[PDB]
């Protein structure tokens, strides 16, 4: 290829070929005049290393380079490694009709539909638009169609709306690890230069919105479109193929809203009356005459399929809160009422939706998830809970616990100075007493923060669960942990040195209070170790995954029943203490090798 100007860009193969043909010409003219044997032997040898280097540079002995110090390319260099033709151009290749952009949410959509920019829709479906407009007879040749789409009149946006109506497309993310990493939706046109996606799919994708890039491709033929619509829909992909855990779990926000919903105080505005139906409940809630989480005697009429699939309606009066009735409005017929009469934990609601899918079906499950999410955001916005500086109730006993621990370690040091204990033994006992003090202060802080709320209860006084915002954000299970809040309020405890040993000096302060130079400096060790491990592990994970996948590419189910009578005796695992995995969770969903009999022998 000629580069800029009258110069040309050459490959190493050209230079290798010219070198070997020059050496061949040297051989040809050399034997013409009967050259001496030493010279012809040396020249033939030089030809041998020349042809060997053309085959492979530096495979035997020293390599050779061009003008640049980089070694010359070989014939095998188009096969070996990533730069080889296999992994660079054969197994994978660049494909036309593709797009890449940045993701956003746009939570006003459905699970099976996603947004897409106007310009990207115009660019991607150019031949389809051309064909449709030619069918409608708005042009004669392609050039007129090209001019009109270059003018982007209003007569083409309606056509683009028409072509997208039922056409599905697929979405892809770069670091996919599971088959659910690619899903196909029906795109919906939206203005802007970004793409909106349903909040559920990113949790399965393990993708946040910090600026990650997204890939999109389009099925062309009818068979491609219908086979896309067939298998990889969001409705058809709700459970992980690896384990029976559903992938439709709500992560952070709507679970927080629902947890705030089903938390009833002892007394508030509009307390202690009766009410007929959840329509009146939401009427009262919007009227503002009663608290959203006030306990009220109400009646419901739920449906139970205890018959042979026949749903029977039963009615009675129940004691509950307003918000539970409001969420009972959105419940379909088949659910029993007792499932929503508690704190509605994240695991609890996950089990609830799993039971709903396994009992009622699929369409009620996905629609129930959709409007549950809608109502969750609605009531979360109505709530408006926020974090505060005073949300970390500092226990008053922290200082005296610190003083007691300091006195104890001073006593231990005094014992050491008397020549009565070794350095290792005193080191261990100081570690033990620091751990004991940490556990005591942790218990004190959690006791202080768990139930400090006090209310006159329209009586004398009482104590109930704590309405600390951090306590709801932690106990709901959305984000955080007991260790995290423990570090937030109490002292963070002890940490280990980079060598693997643990420093004796504790971090006797929380992040709310100030920290000295030394504690931050030592915690830098652990932070750096964690980040280094996270950065380094990815390459090893990728290598091992590729090694695992490259060997099992052939095993495919081919027959129905091999008809063999050989099975395995497998037992629940017990290391010696508590049973680790029960047999029921290990044998579930498998075909019995033989007719297993009850221990009623001969039965």
């Amino acid at each position: 290829v000629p580069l800029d100007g009258g110069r040309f860009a050459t490959s190493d193969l050209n230079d290798l070929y010219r070198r070997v043909i020059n050496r061949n010409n040297r051989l040809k003219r050399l034997l013409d005049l009967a050259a001496p044997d030493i010279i012809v032997r040396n020249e033939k040898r030089m030809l041998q290393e020349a042809v060997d280097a053309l085959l492979d540079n530096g495979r035997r002995g020293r390599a050779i380079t061009g003008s640049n110090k980089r070694p010359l390319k070989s014939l095998a260099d188009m096969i070996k490694g990533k730069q080889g033709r296999f992994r660079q151009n054969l197994l994978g290749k660049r494909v036309d009709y593709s797009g890449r952009s940045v993701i956003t949410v746009g939570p006003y959509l459905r699970l099976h539909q996603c947004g897409l920019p106007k310009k990207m829709a115009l660019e991607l479906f150019k031949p389809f638009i051309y064909g449709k407009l030619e069918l409608r007879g708005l042009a004669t040749t392609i050039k007129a169609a090209k001019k009109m789409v270059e003018r982007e009149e209003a007569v083409v946006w309606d056509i683009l709306d028409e072509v997208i109506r039922e056409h599905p497309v697929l979405l892809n993310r770069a670091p996919t690890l599971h088959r659910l990493g690619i899903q196909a939706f029906e795109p919906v046109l939206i203005e802007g230069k970004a793409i909106q996606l349903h909040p559920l799919v990113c949790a399965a994708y393990n993708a946040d919105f910090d600026g990650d890039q997204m890939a999109v491709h389009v099925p062309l033929t009818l068979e491609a479109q219908l086979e896309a619509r067939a298998l990889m829909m969001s409705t058809n992909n709700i459970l992980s193929p690896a384990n029976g855990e559903p992938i439709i779990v709500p992560s952070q926000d709507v679970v927080l809203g629902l947890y705030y919903m089903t938390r009833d105080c002892v007394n508030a505005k509009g307390e202690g009356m009766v009410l007929t139906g959840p329509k009146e409940a939401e009427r009262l809630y919007r009227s503002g005459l009663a608290s959203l989480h006030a306990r009220v005697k109400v009646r419901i009429t739920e449906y139970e399929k205890d018959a042979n699939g026949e749903l029977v309606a039963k009615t009675s009066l129940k004691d509950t809160t307003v918000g539970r009735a409001i969420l009972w409005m959105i419940v379909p017929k088949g659910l029993p009422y007792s499932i929503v009469n508690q704190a509605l934990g994240k695991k609890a609601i996950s089990k609830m939706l799993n039971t709903c899918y396994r009992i009622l079906g699929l369409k009620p499950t996905v629609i129930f998830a959709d409007q549950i999410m809608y109502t969750g955001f609605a009531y979360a916005a109505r709530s408006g809970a926020s974090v505060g500086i005073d949300d970390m109730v500092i226990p008053e006993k922290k200082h005296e616990i610190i003083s007691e621990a300091e006195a104890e370690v001073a006593e231990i040091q005094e014992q050491f100075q008397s020549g009565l204990v070794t350095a290792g033994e005193r080191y261990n006992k100081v570690i033990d007493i620091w751990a004991a003090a940490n556990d005591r202060v942790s218990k004190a802080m959690m006791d202080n923060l768990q139930t400090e709320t006090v209310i006159n209860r329209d009586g004398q006084e009482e104590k109930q669960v704590s309405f600390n915002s951090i306590y709801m954000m932690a106990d709901s299970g959305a984000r955080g942990s007991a260790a995290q809040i423990r570090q937030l309020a109490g002292m963070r405890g002890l940490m280990a040195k980079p060598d693997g040993s643990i420093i004796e000096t504790p971090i006797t302060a929380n992040f709310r209070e100030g920290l000295n130079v030394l504690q931050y400096f030592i915690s830098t060790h652990g932070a750096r170790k964690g980040l280094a491990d996270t950065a380094l592990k990815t390459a090893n994970s990728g290598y091992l995954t590729r090694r695992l996948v490259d060997v099992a590419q052939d095993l495919v189910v081919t027959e129905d029943d091999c008809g063999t009578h050989e099975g395995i005796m497998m037992t629940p695992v017990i290391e010696g203490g508590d049973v680790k995995e029960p047999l029921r969770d290990r044998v579930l969903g498998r075909v019995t090798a033989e007719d297993v009999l009850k221990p009623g022998t001969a039965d």
Binding site: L90, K93, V95, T104, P107, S383
Partner: protein
């Protein structure tokens, strides 16, 4: 106590601990490094003179000739910085040196030379130093990074457990010279001492020892002790020494003087040791069975026979004892050979030794280092003398010598650059001692084991390589010298040295194209320490320990600043107050502490000295007399945090800011957030982008002024005064009388740098920030630059922040933004792109550069003038034609008969430049560079005339002001000596010469000054001619090009959803949807917030200081709008003075102690109106204000104590049940926009090697499927899908054309065809001698 401009806007500051030392100059490492290499230091050291004396003395092979050196000199630059960056030429200076050539006479080498000749000779060209410390090569500034590497010296490594799989850990010795071959000694699983030269094969240790003409007996004497056996009245006995009996079980009853001292067969005890040392037991007789397991050391020969009774290193037997007894040898000497102390490793190795001659050892090493060559003793000697004793090939630096002496516990820290015999001997002794278990190895992770390089070091190394090559050539020529028939210029070539320096400056591993978009970006890029590069570890081979932070890293290298990715822990940055050692190590300042008082003296401590001492922490409270009120204070001995007595320390920390680097030091409330979030936040601030209009940050750290002054982007005054004239492009200062020099008074001119291209396609612009007529002091700001405001650096903007979940638009990190913020366009940023246009010299005629092109529209050429270049300031769309260009092709082949046939039925080809599609804007500036010898178009003529009038304006104004000063001094002189007060100014100044005066100095000085006036006009005109010739002359370009055209297009990039926003804590986020002004929540007052965040990120990530900055923002905004409301009504200044005094006096004991009683009322009201946009607050790093101080600031205003405020809904307008934390926070915009990574393609070009779509954005391409994507898709059951992925859209050209025709026909059908990449692989394997085929269908 503050200057004039500081009093314009003073920032309120917190802080209790008094400072003792100011922040040093940040850009000091590079300046200190380079102000040693060009400076002509006396007597030569660490500079050019060292390498000169190292290589310049050269002599021929006894040809009675020698070249030597006298002195060097550097010339002035041919161009200034601005012209060099505009044209793209290097900013370099000449290198001039004078050399002497001498030729000795025959039959007298020591006699005086025949003749000498002297000349000046030129070679090489090095770049200069910018004040900002950058290097401009091709019109692009570049920055070199300092390299960290292992310090030269000796080393000891252990290898715990990994090798031999048995726990028998080996030990090795690493010798790393500064410039020479490495040397390695190693152990074996059989405990054999072995050596390896340059990582070659394994050879025994004693080979070199006997190669140094050492007898085996001498080696045994050096490395072993003596045990003496003496023949007496009954055979053999031994002299007993107590220390030779430690930890041993007796072989017999140890009795002497007829008394039992140690019983038979029992272990020696400490009581028995005392018995032995008290009884003075010199001798004892031992049975020969105990002796029969020992080895003789020296060679004993019978003099009568002249034969060897027993050889050296031979185990002794009773027959040999009888032979030596009967031969008359009564003296027997053996070795101690202790089981635990002195193992016979050397003796065993000598037993295994196959060679026992100096000649044999020389032949062995000679054949091992080069197989297949004949051995010779002289050749072996010549090789060995060049191994570790030739200065030319082997050289250890002085610092390496000092490290070597320190590791061997020597006394002189100085020595030669080569090793010695005793060096090898005591190194072997040290390895033996470490093998014995006494002593400890030296870790490589410790800071004192590494040295930091500098630009001068690598510059000198590359210079030395170039000079040794060229001196090899010069010596080759000098071996063929003549009788002064040649010129001293011809043998020397400047080409190799220049090539060596330009390859180092251009494309070295450490000569990367530097990044510059923000002042902090350069100040943190220059202060970078890298472990990569030549002489450094590779990215893949790095383990955890090299990335790990050492306990000694405190106060020297910042552990809180490092990039994240494949390279973490290797691109670390040094601390703030850290400085360099003379040897090349790192040091940190400390405060001298007496017995009870901490003296304000500052000492500098090396990297090792802190181990022997103990240091107190900075935050240690104390009295006003230096006495710590506590007696048990937290300190560290060797990185162990512990509490010691009241008086046991020597030094204490200078301040709390000597721990982190400058990048992390700009984050307030750092102690209340997690370290990892601090890392990502520092990275985000490192990736900032300037905006059109900046606003001051409410929360400051203190060094923002230091950051601004340390950056050269601002024209800081070198001399104070009062500004005479002000303009948007030029500033002139009237110099004060004290600061001005007597002769050539002068007034300085500052020329601002206007809109110009940055390395990140952004704009670098400077604007004035001072009024007219105000006084200015020295070292003060005059005109702000990008993101700079009145002497401080302002990056982001203050937004009314709120923390609550709003309808899920803030799901995890998304954020909703009002259009109110973009109504003023305060977050809109500018972007500028450079377009290249070349008029190359090609075959068949050069290409032509006009717009006379067929097949174009009239409107296409309408924008272009008659010259073919669009007018300045014309709006352009995407994909339009920029300029017209046509290229001749030739190939006429004129047919005289068939010419008419060419017209019956049925050249220069256009190559017009077009703007890439998708980007629009308005053209700003077009620059054309024309090589000399080619006619210049009119457009270039008016461009040159633009530059001409610019130069004429500057020269005329400076000449006019100089003439004004000269005529003023002429009038002042003429007032005395012929007094004419009113006669002088009646007449115009054009005639001030021939006034009638008598014979004094005044009249003669008048003619002299008229002559000086004419002379100054003359040199002014000469300078004008030189400058206009330089501008109008052609410029050197690439071969085969006539001229090059540069195009600058400016685009105003507005905000839009998809952009990446972030704060100052790593709290990332992407804007999701703009929402109308009405729908945000609003308060009782009626001012709604504009940005809403996600409160749920606080529980997850260990960062909580955001609430603190939020409350500080509330306090600052309350003070600011209280001031604004107070000033809105016309009010008297005393109330404002009282209120501001109350505000500034609020707080605990601080170092501010400011009052308004010393300020003019005009200055007071100017500050007051300057503070109406908020009250700036400064906080220290770790001595920041606590919650109580926030409480007093809140109670000063009318805000609630808790800070949380009830809000009204914006969607429907109702009260929320809970109060919500709201406030103001300094949010940052970063360079990663949304419409710069987004791209799509339906159909485009295909590669030539394979018919596949391209990629990227410079080429219209698409994304690529991976093998992992293939696995993901084949996990599902879609079989056809992958088939059309790999068939329809990828390879089959016939198939893709046919389906395209089908699609435009409305049918969507798939036909496979055949992939051609498989055919390509088939042809590849067919090129090899292996036959591929395809069988029957």
């Amino acid at each position: 106590v503050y200057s004039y401009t500081e009093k314009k806007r003073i920032r309120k500051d917190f802080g209790k601990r008094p400072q003792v030392l100011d922040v040093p100059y940040l850009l000091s490492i590079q300046l200190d490094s380079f102000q040693k290499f060009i400076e002509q230091d006396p007597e030569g050291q660490y500079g050019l003179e060292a390498a000169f004396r190292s290589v310049f003395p050269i002599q021929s092979y006894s040809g009675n000739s020698e070249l030597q050196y006298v002195s060097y000199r550097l010339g002035e630059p041919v161009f200034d910085v601005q012209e060099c960056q505009i044209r793209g030429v290097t900013y370099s200076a000449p290198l001039r040196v004078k050399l002497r050539l001498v030729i000795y006479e025959r039959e007298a080498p020591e006699g005086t030379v025949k003749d000498i000749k002297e000349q000046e000779v030129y070679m090489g060209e090095i770049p200069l130093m910018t004040d900002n410390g950058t290097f401009v090569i091709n019109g692009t500034e570049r920055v070199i990074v300092s390299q960290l590497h292992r310090s030269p010296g000796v080393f000891f490594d252990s290898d715990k457990g990994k090798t031999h799989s048995s726990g028998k850990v080996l030990y090795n010795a690493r010798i790393i010279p500064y410039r020479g071959s490495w040397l390695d000694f190693e152990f074996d699983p059989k405990d054999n001492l072995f050596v390896r030269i340059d990582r070659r094969r394994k050879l025994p240790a004693t080979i070199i020892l006997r190669a140094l003409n050492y007898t085996t007996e001498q080696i045994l004497d050096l490395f072993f002790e003596k045990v003496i056996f003496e023949i007496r009245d009954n055979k053999l006995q031994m002299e007993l020494v107590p220390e030779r009996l430690r930890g041993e079980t007796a072989s017999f009853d140890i009795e002497a003087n007829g008394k039992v001292y140690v019983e038979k067969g029992r272990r020696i005890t400490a009581r028995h040791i005392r018995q032995l040392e008290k009884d003075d037991v010199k001798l004892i007789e031992v049975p020969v069975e105990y002796i029969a397991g020992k080895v003789v050391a020296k060679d004993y020969i019978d003099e009568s026979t002249g034969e060897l009774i027993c050889a050296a290193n031979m185990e002794l037997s009773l027959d040999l004892l009888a032979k030596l007894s009967q031969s008359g040898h009564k003296r027997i000497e053996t070795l101690f050979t202790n089981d635990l102390d002195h193992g016979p490793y050397i003796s065993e190795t000598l037993r295994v030794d196959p060679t026992n001659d100096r000649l044999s050892a020389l032949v062995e090493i000679y054949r091992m280092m080069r197989p297949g060559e004949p051995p010779t003793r002289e050749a072996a000697e010549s090789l060995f003398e060049n191994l570790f004793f030739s200065e030319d090939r082997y050289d250890l630096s002085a610092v390496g010598r000092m490290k070597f002496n320190r590791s061997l516990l020597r006394e002189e820290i100085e020595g030669s650059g080569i090793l010695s015999k005793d060096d090898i001997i005591d190194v072997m002794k040290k390895l033996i001692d470490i093998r014995n278990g006494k002593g400890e190895v030296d870790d490589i992770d410790h800071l004192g084991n590494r040295r930091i390089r500098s630009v001068g070091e690598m510059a000198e190394n590359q210079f030395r390589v170039g000079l040794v090559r060229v001196e090899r050539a010069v010596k080759e020529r000098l071996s063929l010298g003549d009788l002064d028939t040649l010129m001293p210029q011809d043998m020397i070539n400047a080409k190799p040295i220049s090539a060596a320096v330009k390859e180092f400056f251009g494309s070295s591993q450490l000569s990367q194209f530097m990044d510059q978009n923000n002042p902090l970006s350069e100040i943190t890029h220059k202060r970078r320490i890298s472990a990569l590069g030549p002489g450094g570890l590779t990215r893949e081979r790095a383990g955890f320990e090299v990335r790990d932070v050492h306990p000694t890293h405190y106060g020297r290298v910042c552990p809180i600043e490092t990039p994240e990715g494949p390279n973490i822990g290797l691109i670390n940055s040094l601390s703030v107050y850290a400085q360099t050692n003379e040897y090349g190590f790192l040091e940190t300042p400390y405060r001298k502490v007496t017995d009870g008082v901490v003296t304000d003296e500052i000492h500098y401590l090396s990297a090792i000295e802190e181990g022997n001492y103990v240091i107190a922490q900075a935050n240690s409270n104390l009295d006003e007399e230096g006495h710590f009120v506590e007696d048990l204070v937290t300190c560290r001995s060797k990185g162990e945090s512990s509490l010691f007595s009241r008086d046991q320390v020597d030094y204490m920390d200078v301040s709390t800011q000597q721990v982190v680097s400058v990048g992390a030091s700009l984050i307030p409330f750092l102690e209340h957030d997690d370290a990892n979030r601090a890392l990502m936040g520092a990275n985000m601030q490192r990736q900032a982008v300037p905006t059109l209009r900046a606003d001051k940050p409410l929360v400051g750290t203190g060094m923002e002024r230091a950051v601004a002054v340390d950056s050269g982007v601002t024209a800081v005054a070198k001399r104070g005064g009062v500004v005479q004239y002000v303009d948007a492009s030029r500033i002139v200062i009237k110099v004060n009388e004290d600061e001005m020099y007597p002769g050539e008074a002068g007034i300085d001119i500052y020329n601002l740098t206007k809109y110009t291209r940055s390395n990140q396609n952004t704009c670098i612009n400077q604007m004035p920030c001072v009024s007219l007529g105000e006084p200015v002091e020295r070292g003060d700001v005059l005109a702000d630059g990008p993101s700079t405001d009145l002497g401080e650096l302002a990056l982001g903007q203050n937004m009314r922040v709120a923390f609550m979940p709003w309808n899920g638009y803030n799901f995890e990190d998304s954020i909703l933004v009002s259009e109110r913020v973009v109504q003023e366009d305060r977050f809109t940023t500018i972007h500028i792109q450079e377009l290249a246009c070349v008029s190359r010299d090609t075959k068949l005629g050069p290409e032509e550069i006009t717009a006379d092109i067929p097949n174009v529209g009239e409107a296409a050429l309408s924008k272009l003038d008659e010259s073919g270049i669009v007018y300045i300031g014309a709006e352009v769309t995407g994909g339009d034609i920029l300029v017209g260009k046509v290229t001749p092709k030739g190939e006429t082949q004129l047919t005289p008969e068939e010419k008419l046939l060419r017209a019956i039925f049925g050249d220069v080809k256009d190559s017009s430049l077009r703007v890439p599609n998708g980007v629009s804007g308005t053209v700003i500036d077009v620059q054309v560079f024309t090589r000399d010898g080619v006619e210049k178009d009119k457009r270039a003529l008016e461009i040159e005339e633009m530059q001409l009038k610019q130069a004429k304006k500057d020269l005329s104004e400076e000449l006019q002001i100089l003439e004004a000063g000269l005529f003023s001094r002429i009038r002042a002189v003429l007032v005395a000596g012929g007094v004419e007060a009113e006669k002088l100014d009646k007449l115009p100044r054009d005639r001030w010469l021939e006034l009638g005066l008598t014979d004094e100095e005044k009249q003669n000085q008048l003619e002299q000054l008229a002559e000086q006036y004419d002379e100054l006009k003359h040199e002014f005109e000469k300078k004008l001619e030189a400058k206009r010739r330089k501008i109008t002359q052609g410029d050197d370009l690439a071969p085969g090009v006539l001229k090059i055209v540069k195009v600058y297009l400016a685009v105003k990039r507005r905000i839009q959803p998809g952009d990446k926003m972030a704060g100052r804590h790593g709290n990332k986020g992407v804007i999701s949807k703009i929402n109308p002004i009405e729908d945000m929540p609003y308060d009782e007052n009626g001012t709604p917030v504009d940005i809403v965040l996600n409160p749920l990120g606080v529980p997850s990530r260990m960062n909580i200081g955001q609430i603190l900055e939020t409350h500080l923002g509330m306090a600052a905004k309350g003070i600011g709008d209280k001031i604004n409301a107070m000033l809105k009504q016309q009010q008297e200044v005393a109330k404002l003075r009282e209120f501001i005094q109350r505000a500034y006096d609020l707080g605990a004991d601080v170092r501010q102690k400011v009052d308004l009683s010393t300020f003019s009322d005009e200055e007071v009201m100017r500050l007051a109106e300057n503070l109406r946009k908020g009250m700036p607050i400064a906080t220290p790093v770790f001595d920041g204000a606590k919650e109580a101080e926030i409480k007093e600031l809140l109670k000063l205003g009318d805000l609630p104590t808790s800070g949380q405020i009830r809000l009204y809904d914006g969607r429907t307008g109702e009260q929320f049940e809970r109060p919500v934390t709201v406030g103001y926070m300094y949010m940052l915009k970063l360079n990663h926009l949304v419409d710069d990574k987004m791209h799509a393609r339906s159909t485009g070009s295909y590669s030539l090697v394979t018919q596949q779509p391209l990629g990227g954005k410079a080429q219209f391409g698409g994304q690529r499927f991976g093998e992992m994507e293939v696995w993901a898709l084949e996990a599902y059951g879609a079989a056809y899908t992958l088939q059309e992925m790999l068939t329809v859209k990828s390879d089959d050209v016939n198939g893709r054309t046919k389906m395209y025709k089908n699609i435009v026909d409305g049918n969507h059908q798939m036909e496979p065809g055949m992939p051609e990449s498989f055919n390509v692989l088939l042809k590849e394997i067919r090129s090899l001698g292996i036959n591929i085929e395809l069988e029957d269908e």
